Amino acid sequence: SRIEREQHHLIESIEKSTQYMAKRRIGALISVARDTGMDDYIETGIPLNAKISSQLLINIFIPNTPLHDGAVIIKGNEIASAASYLPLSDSPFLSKELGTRHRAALGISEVTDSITIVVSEETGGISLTKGGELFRDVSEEELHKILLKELVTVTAKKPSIFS
Ligand SMILES: [Cl-]
């Protein structure tokens, strides 16, 4: 448990799972809690309290399965819940071409500092919401830089479990 290792593993787990789902046009909605709490939305889903892995993220979103219909919420170093409610944005600025997953990702971003990642089941495009804004159809490089900037808070320092 060396925080920096955990944060980089989280980034890699999001990258690998979203890449897998994007190629197959599997819809996905993954919200990562930061300083603002997501606890009430965690309570709306199915509790997992699971180790983060790309494999589990993929298995969650397989269509027509018990865990797929809603958001995954990641809290600290766990996949806290699946099939969670997120508030829908009412914004008329969000394109009508985008679906409920994007509107849900935009809505949680308007009321928390969470970072939310969407895979479109229509296009396979990957999008990201933060602070009421949408980053639509980001490339792999762009997704990587954003996740690095927003989910990694520690620089090169001495590894220690007590960090
Ligand atoms: Cl979608």
Closest by Cα among 146, 148, 77, 159 to 118:
146
> How far, in Å, is the centroid of ligand 1 from the Cα of 118?
8
* Residue 99 annotated as binding site: yes
> How far, in Å, is the centroid of ligand 1 from the Cα of 125?
9
Closest by Cα among 36, 16, 39, 38 to 28:
16
Name the residue ranges covered by the structural domains of the chain.
1-163
How far is Cα 10 from Cα 66, in angstroms, rounded to an integer?
24
Beta strands across the sheet bearing 126-130: 46-51, 78-84, 71-75, 28-32, 115-119, 126-130, 133-135
Amino acid at 10: L
Closest by Cα among 7, 28, 9, 6 to 18:
28
14 and 53 in contact (C-beta within 8 Å)?
no
Please, is 106 exposed, middle or buried when counting C-beta atoms within 10 Å of its C-beta (0-12, 13-18, 19+)? buried
Amino acid at 108: I
The DSSP secondary structure of the chain, one letter per residue, reads --THHHHHHHHHHHHHHHHHHHHTT--EEEEE--SS--HHHHTTSEEEEEE--HHHHHHHH-TTSTT-SSEEEEETTEEEEEEE--PPP--TTS-TTS-HHHHHHHHHHHHS--EEEEE-TTT--EEEEETTEEE-S--HHHHHHHHHHHH----S----TT-
How far is Cα 48 from Cα 2, in angstroms, rounded to an integer?
22
Please, is 64 exposed, middle or buried when counting C-beta atoms within 10 Å of its C-beta (0-12, 13-18, 19+)? exposed
Which pairing describes strands 133-135 and 126-130: parallel, antiparallel, or unpaired?
antiparallel
* Residue 70 annotated as binding site: no
CA torsion sign for 121, 137, 74, 92 is: negative
How far is Cα 145 from Cα 147, in angstroms, rounded to an integer?
6
Phi, psi at 103, each rounded to 5°: -70, -35
Contacts of 32 (CB under 8 A, 6+ apart): 10, 14, 73, 74, 114, 115, 116, 117, 151
* Residue 102 annotated as binding site: yes
* Residue 128 annotated as binding site: no
- Which residue reads 């969670």 in tokens? 84
How far is Cα 46 from Cα 54, in angstroms, rounded to an integer?
19
C-alpha distances in Å from residue 58, one per residue of 24, 30, 62, 94: 11, 11, 7, 27
Please, is 161 exposed, middle or buried when counting C-beta atoms within 10 Å of its C-beta (0-12, 13-18, 19+)? exposed
